[PDB]
Curated annotation (Swiss-Prot), chains A, B, C:
Belongs to the 11S seed storage protein (globulins) family. InterPro entries: 11S_seedstore_CS, 11S_seedstore_pln, Cupin_1, RmlC-like_jellyroll, RmlC_Cupin_sf, Seed_Storage-Functional. The keyword Cytoplasm does not apply. Hexamer; each subunit is composed of an acidic and a basic chain derived from a single precursor and linked by a disulfide bond. CDD domains: cupin_11S_legumin_C, cupin_11S_legumin_N. It comes from the Eukaryota. Mg(2+) binds at K316, R376. It comes from Cucurbita maxima. Disulfide bonds join C2-C35, C78-C211. SUPFAM superfamilies: RmlC-like cupins. This is 11S globulin subunit beta. GO terms for molecular function: metal ion binding; nutrient reservoir activity. Residues 5-184, 217-366 form the Cupin type-1 domain. The keyword Metal-binding applies.
Length: 382, 382, 382
């Protein structure tokens, strides 16, 4: 039993301060979220900040809202050894860079880290699905950290540490072949920095077919938009057709842009939920259910999240300031049907049927289907 | 915890009168149904009747028990524009006709409508699966109508309307580029016809590889039967091998016919449930569980539904009047193992094993496996 | 909500004596098991013993811990008729033999039987997954027997019989074309032998592409090991790459061997649970969760089961007597990431990152990643 009668424009619910930045998490107990099995997290990493490496029981999609940095994402059995510059030496994983507009992927059980190499704050919008095929435990999100001693808030409910602090000193000294002084550091008993630490002194690093697929796609301003309306705005899709790895995690996203008074035509997604996060501006959004009842009718403002349930019809209209968002989909290929427009449910319908449907005349029925010239996004024609 | 100790021959539980016909729905809270995540609906559309277009969160299979008509089933991204006869003009979807014996398909999130073009009553047996991969909400069925103001009984639990009545007048006037008088019709505020309306005056319409697959298969009298016994009756299968689109919705069906005193040999389906709906006559049916206990032993009469749980052994015997049914399967390819017959679990067994199994002799064991000459259906050999 | 805070080294919880041996079952209500949807059963079949044929609603993997015998596993629609030796005659299924080290497969809904043809006791470790795609009922295990009258303990909660005892005498006499005296034997009303009966007098039997795939793989001593450490021990994998049929049931296993004081390096499986059953010796095992808390820290002794949750880090160290186990995986291909070793999460990490991670120096960070020479299993380097 899913309670989708009162959707709400959600704001983060908890905060966790770290040495080099902070972490905000949404209410996983929200009825919409609970029903779809989603979690939202926003990381704000200050310059020279490093988000320690950890892995989760659920696939993640991460949207870079601001800044640029480098990440390290392993991936099981994937040979990735690399030899640094002047090579004494070191062998490491590929150093992957990213910038604003980047939609990064993180498969379940895969550890990763991120570092802000820029001077502005690195803001990351993390979307996790717990009802994903990949997670065999429960609809509850878990992050397993490799270093540090982080206050587990990615889900909350406790002196939580990293995966090593639960192990016996002896055991760890053997496995790694090290002294107890090292087991102390490993366990990070005293680390009071949390999950985003300050990178000390200097950071020089800045250079089975599965092992070859791209782990990101930029759906930002500096890329073509699949749906484009010069006067209205646009939507840039990132599904498995454009990013193969998406078929694996079974997630996808849409980055949308609306100009002043621009409106997204009524529609619903037939095969997935749509966890919308507003990245800029604000808009009036209306969602309706199968009862023909309004389950949401208000404003979504920058920094907020509105979970649009699968099949629920919706309509969006940006404020004078315009509206910009990143919509995560719980399917590798979200299909959106239009109710009004060049290609609509309406257009598909015979005039004879539309007539009897709305007790209108074949002529009025005509103004009904052909009256709308545009497509997905509508240019200020209020 | 599924309560499958007391199956029952179910009758519809609710009724909804419409202008041009009515709608009956079974008890979705029935223990069998609840466990399998199934819903049953029977539409009775009178001549000149139109079942307004709507879409559901779950895949549907529809069996035409009586009559013939035309449907309009869109399907996302599937170009389907068509230009009517003397073309002023109109562009619409393919006009798909159907007759008795037709097993129609309706993928989740796809809207469709049906119209009775015949003079007899058009009777439709709708089977919906909510525990289908395609539905990401909950095991509760939802139908989203595009026009009218229908009393939501496809699940019941309220002034329920169509998807537009939950939207603001302004919003709808823009999206469609219409006057408020039209928004009034669209919202169908006063429509008191329910879901099956009377087609007014005259109805002339009567003419990505996914977009090319068949959306129906006739498993009626005018088609060969995969399993046939001249003296007993037969069973016509409709799985993904015969109808590709079935692999998508992950449903399939079997239309069966039994002559007087004909019996379907004991058997169980290894990979799915079997939601049997009797279309004619009646029969004595016995189901047994893994405890060797009878979980059903009685009569299934025309118009009733018996949900045979996966792996449950069953036996059927038609009355003197014979027995005819349409069995929906919750898998694209239901596999049925036989207990007695030419190809049986018994036949596969070595006489030495059968002996020790039933403390009988190799000779008696012989009369046990080879004693049954026939196959699936058995001709009156009572 | 999965309770994985207190894993435990489980022992069977119930016993069922049969004529020719006995059956032990683990507590399916155990929190770990319940969360992963697993069941454990151990059959001990004495010489000349036959485990009557039955089928389950869930896929099974069976490990032969001791002895050797022959089985009969049908498989739906798979033509398998075979004509015995001096042929009066008999047509039966393929007679499949097996020995110690054999990991047998039993798809859901498929009946099978086993017979001990050796002189030692035939010990079978049966692993069943109820949360497997193949089972459409509930997370509760069910076995449907064809003969005998077994006390249903494979799940317990009753005069439980075989699938025929729930059917009317008349019905069974027709289906099979037999006398009521035979229906009496079939129903096994008086059979008081339970599920493992004594094979009487003499047992001579001892000779769609799906129908051609292997139904077993030996991961015992007389086979190469994918992971091998001369001084430590090894692990023999059985996934879909080595046994195709595994991709169907979506299960796999690992047979491991540890020499005195040998240790399995820290690690976690990213895509499945690991239901470990100790076949010999004992070891100290430590599991840690995402909170960095120890959710298990003790001894696993021969005959016991420890369910290692997905993503949970673990470490194993054999006693002086060594440790040997069979680990069932709830996925057709369990991927294990290493924390310390030649190919580790550690090795993948840049020295610069490891430094800031454990507030250690680039040199100490060096001894951290390259300090461990070995791989999965570690030779006594305590
Ligand atoms: Mg949109
Ligand atoms: Mg959205
Ligand atoms: Mg049948
Ligand atoms: Mg049936
Ligand atoms: Mg291991
Ligand atoms: Mg294990």
């Amino acid at each position: 039993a899913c309670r989708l009668e009162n959707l709400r424009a959600q704001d983060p619910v908890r905060r966790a301060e770290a040495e080099a930045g902070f972490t905000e998490v949404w209410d996983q107990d929200n009825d919409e979220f609970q029903c779809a099995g989603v979690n939202m997290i926003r990381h704000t990493i200050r310059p020279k900040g490093l988000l320690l490496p950890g892995f989760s029981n659920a696939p993640k999609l991460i949207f870079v809202a601001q800044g640029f940095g480098i990440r390290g994402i392993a991936i099981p059995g994937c040979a990735e050894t690399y030899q640094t510059d002047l090579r004494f030496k070191d062998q490491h994983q590929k150093i992957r860079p990213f910038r604003e507009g980047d939609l990064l992927v993180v498969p379940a059980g895969v550890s990763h880290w991120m570092y802000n190499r820029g001077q502005s704050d690195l803001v990351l919008i993390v979307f996790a699905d717990t009802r994903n095929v990949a997670n065999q435990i429960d609809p509850y999100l878990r992050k397993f950290y490799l270093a540090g001693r982080p206050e587990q808030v990615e889900r909350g409910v406790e002196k939580s540490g990293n995966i090593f602090s639960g192990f016996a000193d002896e055991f760890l000294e053997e496995a790694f072949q090290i002294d107890g002084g090292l087991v102390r550091k490993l366990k990070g008993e005293d680390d009071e920095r949390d999950r985003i630490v300050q990178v000390d002194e200097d950071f020089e690093v800045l250079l089975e077919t599965i092992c070859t697929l791209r782990l990101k796609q930029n759906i930002g301003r500096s890329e073509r938009a699949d749906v484009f309306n010069p006067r209205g705005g646009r939507i840039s899709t990132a599904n498995y057709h454009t990013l193969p790895i998406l078929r694996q995690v079974r997630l996808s996203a849409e980055r949308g842009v609306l100009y002043s008074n621009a409106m997204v035509a009524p529609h619903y997604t037939v095969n997935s939920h749509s966890v919308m996060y507003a990245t800029r501006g604000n808009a009036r959004v209306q969602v309706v259910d199968n009862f023909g009842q309004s389950v949401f009718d208000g404003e979504v403002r920058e920094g907020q999240v509105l979970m649009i349930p699968q099949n629920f019809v919706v309509i969006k209209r940006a404020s004078d300031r315009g509206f910009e968002w990143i919509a995560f989909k719980t399917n590798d290929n979200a299909i959106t049907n239009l109710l009004a427009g060049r290609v609509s449910q309406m257009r598909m319908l015979p005039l004879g049927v539309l007539s009897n449907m709305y007790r209108i005349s074949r002529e009025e029925a005509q103004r009904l289907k052909y009256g709308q010239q545009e497509m997905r996004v509508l240019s200020p024609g209020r």
